[PDB]
Design a protein around this ligand. Structure first.
Ligand SMILES: [Ca+2]
Ligand SMILES: [Ca+2]
Length: 312
């Protein structure tokens, strides 16, 4: 498999478990530090990064009734400049730029307790597809599906329903939605980290997924596997292969990667394109840092980049 070696430039450092890279509607850059701890207890943070200086600013340190969060993945909303954050302890949160947040759900549409979330992806219809590799949210004792298959998938809809769309995953992780050229969502990709698999479903509608299939195979027998992911403008899927020193590039049809991107570190965690550019910001857990490198083309527009009132 051809491997390219682009130049990685340092963005910022010392962010415990640097994850969920995201750009808001103003182009501000955010990162989550899920692994920050205070006396052995979770105390995860959401930070704003000044891209010019590398200076970090913690805007939110989520806690619900004393239970600190483990914010791990982000998506920026379209109709309002707010971040939807997958939290390993708190579930789904919505964080404002002023640093205030709200817990979206303690239970799903079926009255079942909410599970801790890791990453999420907004489709062009505004529905949020979330991976929930953790067990029940706080106050429940923290558990994660790295060994046992109790990881679930959710779809937080436009009409506010938190629907569990699938279950029994061994650590569902990165997630992305594939759209038709006209903008219609039709395929969901779910990373199952330890099994070195990328799963796909046909999106038949809001919170409606069918035909579960092993879509792609992640290289290596190392500990880790597919973590964060994102599509480029040509619908190639870039996946951070945690523990492999690479980011895998899958073609529109999946299967085996058609190219690999060597990172000057072994643990790429997540990635995100800077709107309107070929720049990919990459988080990694070896040095707990953020880097950026130039990909071959622009990234696929995120939900926050689309227009509610666009004519075209
Ligand atoms: Ca992740
Ligand atoms: Ca991303």
């Amino acid at each position: 498999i051809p491997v390219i070696e682009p130049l990685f430039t340092k963005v910022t450092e010392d962010i415990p478990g640097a994850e969920g890279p995201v750009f808001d509607k103003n182009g501000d850059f955010y990162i989550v530090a899920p692994e920050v701890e205070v006396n052995g207890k979770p105390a995860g943070e959401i930070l704003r990064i000044d891209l010019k200086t590398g200076k970090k600013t913690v805007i939110c340190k989520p806690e619900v009734n004393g239970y600190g969060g483990i914010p791990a993945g982000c998506q920026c909303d379209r109709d309002a400049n707010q971040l939807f954050v997958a939290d390993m302890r708190l579930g789904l949160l919505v964080v404002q730029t002023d640093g205030t947040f709200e817990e979206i759900a303690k239970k799903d549409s079926e009255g079942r307790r909410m599970q801790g979330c890791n990453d999420c992806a907004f489709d062009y219809e505004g529905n949020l597809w979330i991976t929930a590799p953790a067990g029940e949210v706080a106050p429940a004792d923290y558990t994660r599906s790295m060994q046992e298959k109790f990881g679930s998938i959710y779809c937080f809809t436009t009409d506010g329903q938190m629907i569990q769309v699938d279950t029994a995953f061994q650590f569902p992780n990165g997630i992305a939605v594939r759209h038709m050229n006209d903008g219609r969502p039709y395929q969901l990709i779910v990373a199952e980290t330890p099994t070195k698999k990328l799963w796909s479903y046909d999106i038949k509608g809001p919170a409606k997924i069918e035909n579960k299939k092993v879509w792609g195979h992640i290289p290596g027998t190392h500990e880790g596997g597919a973590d964060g992911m994102d599509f480029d403008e040509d619908n190639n899927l870039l996946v951070a292969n945690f523990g492999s020193s690479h980011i895998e590039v899958f073609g529109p049809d999946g299967g085996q990667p058609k190219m690999r991107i060597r990172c000057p570190f072994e643990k790429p965690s997540n990635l995100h394109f800077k709107p309107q550019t070929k720049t990919i910001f990459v988080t990694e857990h070896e040095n707990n840092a953020v880097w950026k490198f130039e990909w071959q083309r622009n990234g696929k527009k995120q939900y926050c980049e689309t227009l509610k009132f666009g004519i075209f």
